[PDB]
């Protein structure tokens, strides 16, 4: 009934830039949260962002702080993660997750995507 | 206390259904259990009501 | 710039304020009505420094 | 002009239709002569008075 | 009956509205206490017409 | 100050943004209308009363929503009669006096 | 009082309309509007059984 879109990673040289893009179709939304987790090779998920239709109560992991940024389109119903500065362990891999975040019970991430990678090193993937 | 819990980002679902999590650190509960087992995530959605 | 000294002491004074400062809440016009405003006003016969 | 006995008018002079919601400028309106073609009902939101 | 109408819960979760204030966060407290505060009114309405 | 509430929080007055004039708002014509008719049995014929509206602006109005060729046949009479009751139209006045 | 219950929220986001439909979706401003409906509804029964 639904299906999550991802597009837009590869290989860059530390310090360069990218920018991942994920498309959402089969929500009736409301409360749509749409966002990114990060897959280390040897470890689980992890937070990398987050962020609501319209909401704007954002989230970015600890470390993570500064480099990465959020935008979203509702129109085209689609998000997009801007990469900047590109430190070595953000080799990994990225799936965008939806669902909803609600004030008062919680959040669940309902559906998740194909994913896509992306490789921060000297020579390239 | 079940702020560290919800405080924590470690987790892809954290959803309460009759008690909003902030508040669960204010309540006394009377019996309280834990069932615990792995799905799939396409298949978290099914554990909820209806 | 300076900070001169020249600084004394001397204990508060208070007077009454009477049935001052009410100012026009809002700018829509009222002709011979009575209207009742919840905003922050000072209160009648209040302490006032000085 | 109305054919009124004395204490009749007194009884239409003493229940003034003034300070009673819309209705005193209504009849303020039937009393008038000098301001002429005055459609003084269409009053409120959908309130009128037969 | 008027008092015994404070038991019924009119939809919510809690006639009591200290408890429907400590579990639920203030977005989801006021759509419960908007079913109360509906529900009263009604009872109380039907009260003063009788 | 910009507009005027009157009593009961309704908005009455307006200074023009750009001449600082002072405009009335007043809203414009409303009002039920009632049909008059002797009955089915009787006849067809039927007369309509806009009750608190004045007859100089029925007939502006006539391609109203309501007023189909049909309704503009009933509202183009001839017959138009101002009374303190509205505009009544289909309906002859007549200077002689019977019972209500 | 009437006419006055036009100016309350009803627990609406904003008592006019055309704010409502002039800063939300119709499926949102749906439901803000079936509670000014709900509202004013009940204060013309009010107004029509006293």
């Known amino acids: 009934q639904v299906q999550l879109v991802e597009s837009g990673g590869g290989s860059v040289q530390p310090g360069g830039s990218l920018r991942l893009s994920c498309v959402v179709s089969?929500?009736?939304?409301?409360?749509?949260?749409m966002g990114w987790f990060r897959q280390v090779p040897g470890k689980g998920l992890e937070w990398v962002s987050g962020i609501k239709r319209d909401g704007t109560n954002t989230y970015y992991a600890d470390s993570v702080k500064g480099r990465f940024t959020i935008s979203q389109d509702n129109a085209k119903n689609t998000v997009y993660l801007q990469m900047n500065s590109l430190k070595p362990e953000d080799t990994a891999m990225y799936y965008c997750?939806?669902?909803?975040?609600?004030?008062?019970?919680?959040?669940?991430?309902?559906?998740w995507g194909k994913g896509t990678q992306v490789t921060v090193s000297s020579s390239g993937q | 206390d079940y702020s560290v819990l919800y405080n924590s980002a470690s987790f892809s679902t954290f959803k309460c259904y009759g008690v909003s999590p902030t508040k669960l650190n204010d309540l006394c509960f009377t019996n309280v259990y834990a069932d615990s087992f792995v799905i799939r995530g396409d298949e978290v959605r099914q554990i909820a009501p209806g | 710039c300076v900070n001169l000294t020249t600084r004394t002491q001397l204990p508060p004074a208070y007077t009454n304020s009477f049935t001052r400062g009410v100012y026009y809440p809002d700018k829509v016009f009222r002709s011979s009505v009575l209207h009742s405003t919840q905003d922050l006003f000072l209160p009648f016969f209040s302490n006032v420094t000085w | 002009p109305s054919k009124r006995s004395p204490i009749e008018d007194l009884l239409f002079n003493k229940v003034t239709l003034a300070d009673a919601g819309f209705i005193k400028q209504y009849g303020d309106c039937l009393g008038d002569i000098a301001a002429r073609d005055l459609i003084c009902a269409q009053k409120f939101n959908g309130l009128t008075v037969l | 009956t008027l008092v015994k109408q404070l038991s019924s819960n009119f939809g919510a979760i809690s006639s009591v509205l200290n408890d429907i204030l400590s579990r639920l966060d203030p977005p989801e407290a006021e759509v419960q206490i908007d079913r109360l505060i509906t529900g009263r009114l009604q009872s109380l309405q039907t009260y003063v017409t009788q | 100050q910009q507009f005027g509430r009157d009593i009961a929080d309704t908005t009455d007055a307006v200074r023009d943004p750009q001449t600082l004039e002072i405009l009335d708002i007043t809203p414009c014509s409303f009002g039920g209308v009632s049909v008059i008719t002797p009955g089915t049995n009787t006849s067809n014929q039927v007369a309509v009363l806009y009750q608190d509206v004045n007859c100089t602006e029925v007939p502006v109005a006539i391609h109203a929503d309501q007023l189909t060729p049909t309704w503009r046949v009933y509202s183009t009479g001839s017959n138009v009669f101002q009374t303190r009751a509205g505009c009544l139209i289909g309906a002859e006045h007549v200077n002689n006096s019977y019972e209500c | 009082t009437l006419v006055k219950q036009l100016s309350s929220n009803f627990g609406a986001i904003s008592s006019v309309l055309n704010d409502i439909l002039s800063r939300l979706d119709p499926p949102e401003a749906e439901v803000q509007i079936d509670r000014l409906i709900t509202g004013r509804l009940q204060s013309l029964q009010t107004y029509v059984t006293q």
């Open positions: 997750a939806a669902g909803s975040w609600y004030n008062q019970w919680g959040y669940s991430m309902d559906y």
């Open positions: 089969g929500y009736t939304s409301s409360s749509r949260y």
